[model samples]
Target: GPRDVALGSSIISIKNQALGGALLHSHVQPFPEGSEQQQVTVYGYSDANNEWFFQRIRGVEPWTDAENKTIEFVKGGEMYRLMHRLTGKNLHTHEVPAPISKSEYEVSAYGDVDLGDYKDNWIIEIVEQVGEEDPTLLHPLSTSFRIKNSILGCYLAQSGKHLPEWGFRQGEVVCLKHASKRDKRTWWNIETHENERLPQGE
Candidate 1:
């Protein structure tokens, strides 16, 4: 049986298996448009920039490792926040339209000392897997799920469009409206996971 994925305390990588596999990645590169913050993209190959941490913020805390390492597990349908490990920014989105896709919202990295605002919050809605009618908690490497922006009501998805040079030719990541109700583009599965404190899953 797959074990529970510890949240607010683990580092992991999120991958989208639809349309072609891509790992959620972010780097120090600036978007040069939209939010004008750090860039967030999906890389087809493995890279260190793809690493992210699931964190539950507590006010204006610094980006340092949580002093209280009290491990928290992710519950099905629960909302959480994503923090980019390399760029040191929180996975963020805003009301502005995406640079290329005007119809959807722009997804980028925005934060200060790792404690981002409410806009960085996201909800994970897990799809039943292998007869998993209701996933009680997240299982890092085995669980398949969809990400939703808590305040905006949009689902994080791959646009299937490659960005220009500024984005390093990687596929663009956008937040779409009602994507979970849309199609496979919104579906995601974790490709890899690592947590020293929690038990690894199948």
Candidate 2:
């Protein structure tokens, strides 16, 4: 039997009109007769304009009737494995990698210390989720930092107030200013978690 993937009606109708009916595994000429099992997976990427568009089409035909359908893609599990090849990670803990160095540290008015940059050049890596044991605060759980020159490396730390001024945070799309030399500064907006209640001050 032919399955209907999450493909919208416009696409479904297009497939039906072009191919006779909804695209079926049996209908497709690529696979053999017994191999007509249907499956569907949707993948997408953001354009330069920050708009997301689906790129790769896999599995069975993904055409159905729906209007303005918005599909949210999550990374991790199989998806993470698929994209991990394109991303970098430092195998260290509680410290940025060596090569260049840390120049200064700035303590925020709110009390948390901001580990100042050596030359305003570092990549914002992973962000840890808040631990269940402790009360939640406006501050981040932890942040991983990276600087690329010859090879890729990273470190982990707690981000204080002043650091957020750079608008760097988790889940932001940014281009490395110097990917080749491994001396790259990330460019992105920092967003605070306003919807949640902040913990008592330290």
Candidate 3:
């Protein structure tokens, strides 16, 4: 069965999963030395934009609205792309090899350029839990899923691999194909936090 997620869901990573140490974040502060396209991650709270964000490692920090961390998972015929609440950038990739691995492609934050392109799309397939009655019947928020780049045909992966000295030296979040489906690095869990709280007067 298919599950639907609410608008203000927070994407939580599975415990002990790859790149699970940090949440997907953006480089909002001083901005990376390179193009504004590159995004990074951080630990603890920053705001939303610069706080726990996404791919590749090591970067600056800044404060942003919780809505910046807020993402909408739009389903398009069994596939989806995380649309950033503030920047409207889609988790994207291209022909350039990752900073660490020449074979794997680097994941980047893409906005405005060729919107709706297949490269910006991703397939969210649920990870079957052991002893589960039926994996397909899991809810979208509860189930852990692997994100595959639709156009690149590779699973979203992260490792100790770090970008070049010129880059951020952050752990490389590259898109690669794994031989085993049980690879933990690619599995992710989507969690949401409630923001609909009462006002001071109310």
* Highest-scoring model, TM-score: 1
Which 10-residue window in model 3 sums to the lowest lDDT? 51-60
User: Which candidate tops lDDT?
Assistant: 1
lDDT of 2 by residue, 1-202 (tens): 0111111110111111111111101110111111111111111222121211111122223222242445322211111101010111111112222111232121111100122122222233322323442221112222112322112232111121111212221111112222332222221111111111223223
Using TM-score, rank the candidates from best to worst.
1, 3, 2
Each prediction's TM-score versus the true structure = 0.87, 0.16, 0.62
Error of 1 at 88 (Å): 2.2
Sorting all predicted structures by lDDT, with the top scorer first, yields 1, 3, 2
What global local distance difference test value does model 2 have?
A: 0.18
lDDT of 3 by residue, 1-202 (tens): 1243333242322221554443454443322333335564323343455311221111212123454654443332256555554565666777766655667666777653235356776776776544443454323345666778777789776644655543445455667755257787676654333233211111
Regions of model 1 farther than 4 Å from truth: 57-69, 113-115, 131-134, 180-182
Which one wins by TM-score: 1 or 2?
Answer: 1
Candidate 3 achieves a global lDDT of 0.49
Cα TM-score of candidate 2: 0.16
TM-score, cand. 3? 0.62
Cα RMSDs of all predictions?
Answer: 2.8, 22.6, 8.8
Model 1: ten consecutive residues of lowest lDDT: 57-66
